[PDB]
Amino acid sequence: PGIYTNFKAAAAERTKAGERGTVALPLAASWGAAKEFVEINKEEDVEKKLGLSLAHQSFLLLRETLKLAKTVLVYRLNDGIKATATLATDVVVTAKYGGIVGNSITIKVDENVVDSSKKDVTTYLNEVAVDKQVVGTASELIDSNYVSFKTTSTSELQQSSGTTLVGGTDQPVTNLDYTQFLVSAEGEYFDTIAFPVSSSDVALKTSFVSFVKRMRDEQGVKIKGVVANMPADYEGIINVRNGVTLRDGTILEPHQVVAWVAGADASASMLKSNTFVKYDGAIDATPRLANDEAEEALQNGEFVLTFDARDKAVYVEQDLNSLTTFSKEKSSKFRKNKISRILDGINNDTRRNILDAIKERKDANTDIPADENGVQFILSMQTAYLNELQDSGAITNFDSTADITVSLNNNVDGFIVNQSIEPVDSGEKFYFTTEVKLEH
DSSP: OOHHHHHHHHHHHTTOOSSEEEEEEEEOOSSSOSSSEEEESSHHHHHHHHSSOTTSGGGHHHHHHHTTEEEEEEEEOOEEEOOBOEETEEEEEEESSOSGGGGGEEEEEEEOTTOTTSEEEEEEESSSEEEEEEESSGGGOOOOSSEEEEEEEEEEOOOOSOEEOBOOEEEOOOHHHHHHHHHHGGGOOOSEEEOOOOSSOHHHHHHHHHHHHHHHHTTOOOOEEEEESOOOOOTTEEEEOOOEEETTOOEEOHHHHHHHHHHHHHHOOSSOOOTTOBOTTEEEOSSOOOHHHHHHHHHTTOBOEEEETTTTEEEESOOBOSOOOOOSSSOGGGGBHHHHHHHHHHHHHHHHHHHHHHHHHTTTTOOOOSSHHHHHHHHHHHHHHHHHHHHTTSBOOOOSSTTEEEEEOSSSSEEEEEEEEOBSSSSOOEEEEEEEESOO
């Protein structure tokens, strides 16, 4: 227990096999917070939080993401009119959220059998009860995750056989909504973010790539972005090239395939790449690419899917990112996602594990001092982490001596952690320096 085991836990979490990553996915639904995220891990979550079944057509992309992602943070792009209706006598009942899902809501108020002085106000959603309240007066009605009662002066709860709400509607998705999605994305913890925007508007795709560039190289949060046909020449973006065709015959354009790829990158282990990973459910890659086109594509940092007629399944040609223009600073190695996932991860954990210890030592009233003892402490901690990654086989040739160093922020108000790590298969140690401030 305590900080220590947490640091090892971190690295251990990085190699653990099984359900993984959580990906932020923008979608349009007919029910929900609107301009806010919704966390879903189980199929039930979908219906309970968005009013429809996960099998609905509205969640096509969602399902594709869930094919490999453990968690999906769906953001409602749109919004809509809230269904309404007047119950018995002046009892305005409006749906909680906006959207056509409110039109499936229906309140049936009867008389109480265990007390003739009260009424049995129940709310239905598609002929299935979801909220029942046994109240005496209109005021005793407490708002639910489905309705909102408005008690007025002339309020009289008359028995009703079944009055249904109406007027629910959802306004189509505007390009503005996608911008707001990137804004709310700042306050969410996810591994990968998908941008299934239509290949039409180029501006959006650009503003998306910028958003990712900031998050990573400016805010320090090393996340991955996925867009279709968008050579951002940046190691933080995956450029999906082609699409696929599912068994049921449905055709998925590359801008849709991103949904899957997002979950694919988000679930990938630090030890395993995504090359030769099959796209479960896809019977063909449309369009297909000839050897020269493919070899060409890869050369340009494109994430391509190829159909293997032998095993009759489609798989990832190579887990690469849009980065093409390399250099002294960041070598070519940075295009290969495997090497990147290790690096990104490391850094990411370095900063969070340090922050946790900070705000944890503070809760015990033993704040980590900005002196030599503080440095040593953190150094010793990160070291445990680093070694763990070596043991789990994520990184090799790690010398606790000249590979990790910690110092003061020059303003003695934070810690600077410099480290040279080497991802398993890649003869090259990379230099990484993360700064953590005692008070953010």
